[PDB]
């Protein structure tokens, strides 16, 4: 049994309704008359929690705003008026024989486009004495989450030697922050001069570049 | 109602076996179905198997058949999940979950309306040894940004604080990333008034409980 | 006067754990005459009154329908007296016997236990001769799915704790297959 959940992510303006869909490769309607489909929410940093069970039964203490519907292969979770508390990843789960979860839908708060403030940080001389150089490019407080950060040393693209990480959505301004970290050996770092990260984002008219020369 | 308390985090060498517990409180333990569900970092939920203690009958997902053993002990109201031949892909948070208990009957032998969840158990499969982080400054260049690079620690987690908790506004501590060396790394940054850089002291407090080390690191312009 | 078998020639015969019992006294009856309406597959045998139990039962479980078996049928579903002459007959409904109707499937009880209010002691509920399983109050007349788990919390008056049962199913055959349990009391 394959569960196809859509969409992958769902920006919702607060107060507006939201709908999540789950399609199963085979009917979930049991001969006992119930559809074996549950909906779960996992808020950031928390254990999952039950919202809907057996297709349309609201779990204890779940607000009237959540409702499940559907029969057979197509199922829908509806939230009448989305609230900040509702952010997280929603999962459907079929239970017709052996349970299986859908891929998840990340619900986030929709807000106006905000450009990121970009900062670049050279590696400290302290780190250099250990044999490794880390360069940090910071993208601060932006929306939407989608952004692209490319590293160029002496105007040559770097690939395979950087990792990035993103914060969870801020519950006050609905923005994201991102860091990208380029790692080079000491010998490789001291073989070049110009270090730059190039930031592409929806809120920026052209790619923004922050750079420094080693020295 | 029902409470599910799991055993604590573990670090396991590749190839070994882990056993996680889940102690249940409230209701007749032997009567209700318990499942185990895992979540690899950044990934979705994945059902592993379950058991109804009074039957002693455990079932498993085909993916975990032959590697996972789920048992239950009615004398302590505890369920166990044992997973053998650990690989790095088995690094995950493991959850126990129990049916809500109000379905009239359990179709096919088992109920799966997971109304109750444990707090999760992080299992880290790795060859790495416990190791505290190196803390390197991110020196600042209206508003200025500065930070600390908390690099090459194992295992998770680390907590970071600024000026012993006195500075919280504008702080971003990023989720750790697993480096190819097998060691974790994260950065913590904060935005501050550019004028106060010559008078205000900014100190990074980094705590790594697995290595029992808490260190302080001053961050200042170069 | 002739004993009337008409109750069993019309309708859907119950599953083994709900065996229907007919009791005959003060009438003549020829068992072979009754069996001439069926296609008999097997019989095993070990007046004041004739007791005739009947039920749907699949021929593929004939080894379970035995006084000897430590299987779930004799443990939890149906058991005859060991002190009276008894017979067990497995037969198929022929196509020209149109008034016996088929259930959706064959069902039987695979486990029936009490769980006492000490929250520790499980007690298998072995069926007695001439009695129904205590679990017929929680197992439906047809089991919904193989492996179903039925349960009920009992009252203080009922002894506390829980009653639990597990159900099994066997696919329906093209012609309905039936079991007959016969016990005679000689005077
Ligand atoms: C027809 O009915 C008789 C009973 O009168 C039975 O013995 C016989 O087996 C039946 N034959 C068929 C083909 O159903």
């Amino acid at each position: 049994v394959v569960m196809t959940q859509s969409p992958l992510s769902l920006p919702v303006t607060p107060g507006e309704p939201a709908s999540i869909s789950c399609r199963s490769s085979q009917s979930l309607l049991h001969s006992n008359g119930y559809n074996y489909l549950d909906w779960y929410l996992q808020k950031p940093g928390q254990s999952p929690q039950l919202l809907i069970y057996l297709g349309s039964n609201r779990a204890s203490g779940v607000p009237d705003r959540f409702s499940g519907s559907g029969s057979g292969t197509d199922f829908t979770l509806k939230i009448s008026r989305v609230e900040a508390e509702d952010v997280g990843v929603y999962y459907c789960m079929q239970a017709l024989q052996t349970p299986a979860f859908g891929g998840g839908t990340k619900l986030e708060i929709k807000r106006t486009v905000a450009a990121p403030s970009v900062f670049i940080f050279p590696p400290s001389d302290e780190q250099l004495k250990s044999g490794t150089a880390s360069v940090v490019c910071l993208l601060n407080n932006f929306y939407p989450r989608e952004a692209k950060v490319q590293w160029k040393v002496d105007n040559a693209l770097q690939s395979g030697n950087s990792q990035e990480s993103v914060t969870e959505q801020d519950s006050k301004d609905s923005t994201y922050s991102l860091s990208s970290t380029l790692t080079l050996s000491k010998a490789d770092y001291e073989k070049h001069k110009v270090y730059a990260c190039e930031v592409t984002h929806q809120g920026l008219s052209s790619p923004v570049t922050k750079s420094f020369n080693r020295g | 109602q029902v409470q599910l308390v799991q055993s604590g985090a573990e670090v396991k060498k590749p190839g070994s076996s882990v056993k996680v517990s889940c102690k249940a409180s409230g209701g007749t333990f032997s009567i209700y179905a318990i499942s185990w569900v895992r979540q690899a970092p950044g990934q979705g939920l994945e059902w592993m198997g379950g058991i109804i203690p009074i039957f002693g009958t455990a079932n498993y997902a085909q993916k975990f058949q032959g590697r996972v053993t789920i048992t239950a002990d009615k004398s302590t109201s505890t369920a166990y999940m044992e997973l053998s031949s650990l690989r790095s892909e088995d690094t995950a948070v493991y959850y126990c979950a129990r049916e809500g208990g109000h379905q009239g009957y359990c179709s096919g032998g088992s109920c799966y309306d997971f109304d109750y969840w444990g707090q999760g158990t992080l299992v880290t499969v790795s060859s790495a040894s416990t190791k505290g982080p190196s803390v390197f400054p991110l020196a600042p260049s209206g508003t200025a940004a500065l930070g600390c690079l908390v690099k090459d620690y194992f295992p998770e987690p680390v907590t970071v604080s600024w000026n012993s908790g006195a500075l919280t506004s504008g702080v971003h501590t990023f989720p750790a990333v697993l480096q190819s060396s097998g060691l974790y790394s994260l950065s913590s940054v904060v935005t501050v008034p550019s004028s106060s850089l010559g008078t205000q002291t900014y100190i990074c407090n980094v705590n790594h409980k697995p290595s029992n080390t808490k260190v302080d690191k001053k961050v200042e312009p170069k | 006067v002739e004993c009337d078998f008409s109750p069993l020639l019309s309708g859907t015969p119950p599953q083994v754990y709900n065996f229907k019992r007919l009791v005959f006294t003060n009438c003549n009856y020829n068992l072979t005459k009754l069996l001439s309406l069926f296609s008999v597959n097997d019989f095993t045998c070990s007046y004041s009154s004739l007791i005739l139990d009947y039920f749907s039962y699949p021929l593929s479980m004939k080894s379970d329908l035995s006084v000897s078996s430590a299987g779930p049928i004799s443990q939890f579903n149906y058991k005859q007296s060991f002190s009276n002459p008894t017979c067990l007959i497995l037969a198929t409904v022929p196509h020209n016997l149109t008034t016996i109707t088929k259930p959706l499937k064959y069902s039987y009880i695979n486990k029936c236990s009490r769980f006492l209010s000490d929250d520790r002691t499980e007690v298998p509920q072995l069926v007695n001769a001439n009695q129904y399983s205590p679990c017929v109050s929680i197992v439906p007349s047809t089991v919904w799915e193989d492996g179903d788990y039925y349960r009920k919390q009992l009252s203080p008056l009922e002894g506390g704790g829980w009653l639990v049962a597990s159900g099994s199913t066997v696919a329906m055959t093209e012609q309905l297959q039936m079991g007959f349990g016969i016990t005679v009391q000689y005077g």
Side-chain angles (χ1 to χ4, degrees):
Chain A
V1 182
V2 183
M3 306 296 300
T4 303
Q5 187 174 339
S6 54
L8 293 182
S9 85
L10 182 56
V12 188
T13 299
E16 298 298 295
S19 286
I20 303 176
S21 300
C22 186
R23 293 187 90 175
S24 160
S25 56
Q26 61 185 79
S27 176
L28 299 184
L29 171 60
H30 196 273
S31 69
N32 65 16
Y34 295 99
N35 280 270
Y36 277 78
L37 192 278
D38 299 357
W39 290 97
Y40 297 86
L41 169 60
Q42 183 175 34
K43 298 173 180 173
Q46 295 186 27
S47 296
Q49 60 190 92
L50 180 59
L51 303 168
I52 305 292
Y53 64 99
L54 287 177
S56 60
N57 300 97
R58 195 153 49 242
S60 170
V62 174
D64 310 53
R65 309 184 287 101
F66 300 82
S67 67
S69 60
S71 187
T73 63
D74 288 56
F75 297 86
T76 303
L77 171 62
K78 262 192 280 291
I79 311 174
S80 54
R81 48 197 166 280
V82 161
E83 193 179 300
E85 191 72 54
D86 303 327
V87 160
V89 184
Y90 290 77
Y91 298 93
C92 57
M93 194 199 72
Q94 65 88 14
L96 184 55
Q97 202 146 34
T98 291
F101 293 90
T105 296
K106 185 209 159 195
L107 187 152
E108 75 178 65
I109 294 307
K110 186 173 182 296
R111 58 148 293 166
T112 58
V113 172
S117 301
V118 183
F119 305 86
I120 191 166
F121 294 103
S124 65
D125 299 335
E126 212 168 5
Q127 192 191 3
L128 299 179
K129 289 136 69 180
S130 67
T132 307
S134 307
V135 194
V136 180
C137 184
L138 171 63
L139 285 60
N140 214 21
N141 303 323
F142 60 94
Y143 186 90
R145 164 189 273 254
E146 188 169 48
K148 200 135 170 295
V149 192
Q150 276 186 332
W151 285 100
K152 291 191 179 65
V153 313
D154 293 332
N155 208 12
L157 177 72
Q158 302 293 285
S159 65
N161 50 4
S162 56
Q163 298 183 288
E164 55 187 31
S165 80
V166 192
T167 61
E168 213 79 48
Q169 183 175 51
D170 192 325
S171 70
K172 270 67 182 182
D173 45 61
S174 302
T175 61
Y176 298 91
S177 288
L178 188 148
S179 70
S180 182
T181 307
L182 183 74
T183 300
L184 300 173
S185 69
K186 172 181 174 53
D188 283 349
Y189 177 71
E190 294 173 343
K191 282 166 177 293
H192 301 103
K193 189 55 63 193
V194 184
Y195 288 80
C197 60
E198 199 206 80
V199 170
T200 300
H201 188 262
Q202 176 174 341
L204 297 172
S205 302
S206 64
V208 167
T209 291
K210 291 306 182 60
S211 53
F212 69 92
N213 304 292
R214 171 176 48 85
Chain B
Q1 327 154 77
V2 186
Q3 271 205 56
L4 303 172
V5 179
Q6 300 183 221
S7 43
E10 302 213 40
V11 173
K12 300 265 96 176
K13 302 287 189 180
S16 67
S17 296
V18 67
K19 197 173 181 180
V20 179
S21 66
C22 171
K23 186 182 183 66
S25 298
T28 308
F29 167 80
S30 297
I31 291 301
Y32 301 98
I34 301 175
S35 284
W36 290 88
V37 173
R38 80 177 189 187
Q39 184 168 35
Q43 306 290 313
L45 299 169
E46 186 176 15
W47 184 83
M48 299 182 59
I51 185 176
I52 290 77
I54 191 171
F55 288 141
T57 303
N59 61 342
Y60 309 96
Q62 196 258 7
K63 172 179 178 179
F64 301 104
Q65 187 78 231
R67 285 209 302 149
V68 182
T69 309
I70 296 175
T71 50
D73 180 359
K74 61 185 183 186
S75 74
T76 63
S77 305
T78 305
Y80 302 89
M81 191 278 300
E82 178 168 28
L83 173 63
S84 71
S85 294
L86 291 179
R87 301 179 286 273
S88 46
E89 306 95 66
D90 297 309
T91 296
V93 178
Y94 292 79
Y95 297 100
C96 63
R98 209 208 75 170
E99 63 163 309
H102 298 100
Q103 288 195 58
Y105 82 101
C106 293
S107 171
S110 301
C111 286
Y112 300 116
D113 54 311
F114 294 133
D115 204 22
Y116 300 107
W117 291 74
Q119 84 279 24
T121 298
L122 175 61
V123 178
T124 296
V125 183
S126 178
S127 302
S129 303
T130 298
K131 169 168 153 34
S134 300
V135 184
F136 302 110
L138 300 175
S141 181
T143 57
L146 67 123
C148 288
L149 174 67
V150 183
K151 182 170 169 68
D152 293 336
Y153 64 91
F154 180 88
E156 288 263 54
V158 292
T159 62
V160 180
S161 88
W162 285 90
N163 294 347
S164 299
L167 171 62
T168 54
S169 296
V171 178
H172 289 117
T173 297
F174 289 93
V177 302
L178 185 51
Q179 303 167 105
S180 53
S181 60
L183 307 180
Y184 293 88
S185 175
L186 61 78
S187 230
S188 178
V189 303
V190 55
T191 52
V192 304
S194 183
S195 59
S196 68
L197 282 163
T199 168
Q200 185 56 53
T201 298
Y202 295 106
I203 296 174
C204 214
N205 325 109
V206 182
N207 186 15
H208 186 240
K209 294 191 179 303
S211 63
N212 194 25
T213 63
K214 193 175 187 177
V215 295
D216 302 316
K217 179 70 177 174
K218 178 198 246 296
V219 187
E220 60 179 8
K222 185 166 188 57
Chain C
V1 198
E2 205 67 25
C3 312
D4 191 23
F5 298 117
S6 296
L8 75 98
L9 300 178
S10 288
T12 303
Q15 299 306 310
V16 58
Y17 49 97
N18 290 131
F19 57 93
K20 179 66 180 176
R21 170 158 294 191
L22 306 172
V23 178
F24 297 101
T25 65
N26 301 127
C27 57
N28 303 98
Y29 62 95
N30 194 330
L31 171 63
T32 83
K33 261 62 180 184
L34 169 65
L35 297 181
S36 70
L37 304 183
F38 296 82
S39 306
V40 179
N41 302 111
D42 291 286
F43 64 77
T44 308
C45 296
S46 167
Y47 87 95
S48 183
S49 63
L50 175 87
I51 299 174
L52 175 62
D53 303 318
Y54 68 96
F55 43 89
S56 302
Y57 194 84
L59 192 64
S60 57
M61 293 187 62
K62 74 188 205 88
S63 63
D64 288 83
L65 203 49
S66 169
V67 182
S68 307
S69 179
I73 302 295
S74 56
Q75 283 195 117
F76 305 113
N77 292 265
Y78 179 66
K79 174 165 291 168
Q80 304 173 292
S81 166
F82 59 83
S83 57
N84 299 271
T86 55
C87 295
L88 219 34
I89 300 152
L90 299 184
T92 299
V93 175
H95 288 306
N96 63 15
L97 207 183
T98 68
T99 52
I100 294 180
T101 46
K102 298 159 69 173
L104 288 179
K105 71 194 69 168
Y106 304 98
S107 303
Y108 63 92
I109 293 167
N110 187 256
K111 301 183 204 62
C112 174
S113 285
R114 292 264 287 107
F115 198 67
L116 302 192
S117 63
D118 62 4
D119 278 2
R120 295 296 132 88
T121 308
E122 196 219 282
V123 183
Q125 299 295 294
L126 302 171
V127 65
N128 302 292
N130 302 319
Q131 291 189 4
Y132 295 108
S133 167
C135 288
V136 295
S137 60
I138 69 179
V139 177
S141 52
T142 287
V143 169
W144 292 106
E145 178 178 346
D146 188 63
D148 283 350
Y149 165 30
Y150 307 101
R151 63 186 170 201
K152 186 179 67 175
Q153 196 156 214
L154 303 181
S155 56
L157 178 65
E158 288 176 313
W162 291 78
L163 187 68
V164 304
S166 187
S168 293
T169 68
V170 175
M172 180 50 47
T173 51
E174 199 56 39
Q175 297 173 73
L176 184 60
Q177 298 163 348
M178 287 178 67
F180 300 87
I182 299 173
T183 305
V184 310
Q185 288 79 14
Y186 280 127

